[PDB]
C-alpha cells in the first residue's frame, strides 16, 4: 500500500523553503481540498507513473499561494507549482501542533532570492543576500540580509498567523 | 516536563581540546534545533552555535569559527560541542538550549575553565 | 550589526513595586522577534517573553512586554521577592546567531 499515512500522519513537518518529497477521499469540512487538472472521483480509475507527496507549514494567509499562477513571498521563493500542474493541494489547520504547546520552530520561510524560483525547485542556500552595491563576502549588514527569516506562530493570532500543514500531491 | 543536562566541561591548559555533552529527554529530540550559548563569568549571555534540523546547517560565531565543531547523535539524544585550539576568552559557563524562536527550555550550564 | 541596549543599568525597586525595563535597538525591528528573559545567580536563564508580549508557559501575569519598532518594554506589575534577578533581552528569529542585551539588574532598595 501507497505509504500514504507517513506524510499527513507525520510528527512534524519541513520548512516552506526545504520542503519535503516523499517519492510514491471523503475527508471533512475543515480540510483544503483544492484539485488541479484531474477530478477526485477519478483517481481510483487511473494509473499514474510517479507520484509525488510534497509538505511543509505555513501561515494561514499563505495558502492561497500554493496553486498554479500565483504569485507572492512563498511561491516566488520557496514553493512554486508549475500553470499545468496536474494535481491536488491539501491543508488544514495543525495549531494544536506547531504553536505554542508544542514550540515547534521547524517551520521557516525565504524572504530575498535574487530571482524567482522555477517550478518545484527547492532552494536551501543560506548565502547572504546582496540587496545593494557593496559584495556582502557573508557579513550581515547594510543590503546584506539572510535570506531565511521564521515563523512566530503565537495563539493568539487569528488563522492568517496559524500554522497549516500542506500536503501537495503530484501526478505524473 | 522537557529537561536537559550538560556534561563534559572541566579544566583545560590552551591550545587542548575538549568535547561538551547535553543529554535531552522528555522530547522528540530529533524535530528540535540545539543552540549552545556560554556567559563568561561576570559578562552577558554570548551566542556559539547552531545546529538546525531541517537540512544540517551548522552555524558558527566568529570568535569560534575554525575551532569548534557541534555535531549531534539524535539516536542517543544528545548534542555535543567539541572544542580545539581553546583560549583562554572561552572560559564561560557553556549554556544548552532549544533553537525553537526564543529557547523554551535550557540546560543545566557546565563551566569550562581555559587557564595554563 | 544589530547591537542592543538596555537601561538602566541597576534598577533599585522595593518589593511591591511597578518594574519598568527598557531595551533599545540599533535598527527597527518587527515586534515578532524579541524577547525576555530573567535570571537568578547560578541559573540558567529562563525564557519569560517572546515576540515582544507573549509570556512562556508558567510566567505569572505580572509580566507584561509591549513595543514595537526601536523601543521595548517589560513591565513588572507588583514586585515580588522572587523577582528580583537579572534580566536581559534579545533579537533572536531573524538570523541564526542570537544577540543579547547587556542586562539590568533589579536589586533591593534601603
Known amino acids: 500500500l501507497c505509504p500514504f499515512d507517513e506524510v499527513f500522519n507525520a510528527t512534524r513537518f519541513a520548512s516552506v523553503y526545504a520542503w519535503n518529497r516523499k517519492r510514491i477521499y471523503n475527508l471533512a469540512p475543515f480540510f483544503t481540498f483544492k484539485c488541479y487538472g484531474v477530478s477526485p472521483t477519478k483517481l481510483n480509475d487511473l494509473c499514474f507513473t510517479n507520484v509525488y507527496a510534497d509538505s511543509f507549514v505555513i501561515r494561514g494567509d499563505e495558502v492561497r499561494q500554493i496553486a498554479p499562477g500565483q504569485t507572492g513571498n512563498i511561491a516566488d521563493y520557496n514553493y512554486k507549482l508549475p500553470d499545468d500542474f496536474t494535481g491536488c493541494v491539501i491543508a488544514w489547520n495543525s495549531n494544536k501542533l506547531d504553536s505554542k504547546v508544542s514550540g515547534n520552530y521547524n517551520y521557516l520561510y525565504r524572504l530575498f532570492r535574487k530571482s524567482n524560483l522555477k517550478p518545484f525547485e527547492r532552494d536551501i542556500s543560506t548565502e547572504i543576500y546582496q540587496a545593494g552595491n557593496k559584495p556582502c563576502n557573508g557579513v550581515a549588514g547594510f543590503n546584506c540580509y539572510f535570506p531565511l527569516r521564521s515563523y512566530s506562530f503565537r495563539p493568539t493570532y487569528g488563522v492568517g498567523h496559524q500554522p497549516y500543514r500542506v500536503v501537495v500531491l503530484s501526478f505524473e | 516536563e522537557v529537561q536537559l543536562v550538560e556534561s563534559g566541561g572541566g579544566v583545560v591548559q590552551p591550545g587542548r581540546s575538549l568535547r561538551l555533552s547535553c543529554a535531552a529527554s522528555?522530547?522528540?529530540?530529533?524535530?528540535?534545533?540545539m543552540h549552545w550559548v556560554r556567559q563568561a563569568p561576570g559578562k552577558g549571555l554570548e551566542w556559539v552555535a547552531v545546529?538546525?534540523?531541517?537540512?544540517?546547517?551548522?552555524f558558527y560565531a566568529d570568535s569560534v569559527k575554525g575551532r569548534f565543531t557541534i555535531s549531534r547523535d539524535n539516536s542517543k539524544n544528545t548534542l555535543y560541542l567539541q572544542m580545539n585550539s581553546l583560549r583562554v576568552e572561552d572560559t564561560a559557563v557553556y549554556y544548552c538550549?532549544?533553537?525553537?524562536?526564543?529557547?523554551?527550555?535550557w540546560g543545566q550550564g557546565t563551566l569550562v575553565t581555559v587557564s595554563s | 550589526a544589530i547591537r542592543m541596549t538596555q537601561s538602566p543599568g541597576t534598577l533599585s525597586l522595593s518589593p511591591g513595586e511597578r518594574a519598568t525595563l527598557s531595551c533599545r535597538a540599533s535598527?527597527?525591528?518587527?515586534?515578532?522577534?524579541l524577547a525576555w528573559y530573567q535570571q537568578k545567580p547560578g541559573q540558567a536563564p529562563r525564557l519569560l517573553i517572546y515576540?515582544?508580549?507573549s509570556r512562556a508557559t508558567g510566567i505569572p501575569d505580572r509580566f507584561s512586554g509591549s513595543g514595537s519598532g526601536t523601543d521595548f518594554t517589560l513591565t513588572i506589575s507588583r514586585l515580588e521577592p522572587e523577582d528580583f534577578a537579572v534580566y536581559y533581552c534579545?533579537?533572536?528569529?531573524?538570523?541564526?546567531?542570537?544577540?543579547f542585551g547587556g542586562g539590568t539588574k533589579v536589586d533591593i532598595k534601603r
Open positions: 522528555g522530547f522528540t529530540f530529533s524535530n528540535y534545533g
Open positions: 545546529y538546525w534540523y531541517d537540512g544540517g546547517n551548522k
Open positions: 515576540g515582544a508580549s
Open positions: 535598527q527597527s525591528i518587527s515586534s515578532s522577534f
Open positions: 534579545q533579537q533572536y528569529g531573524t538570523s541564526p546567531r542570537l544577540t
Open positions: 538550549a532549544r533553537d525553537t524562536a526564543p529557547p523554551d527550555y
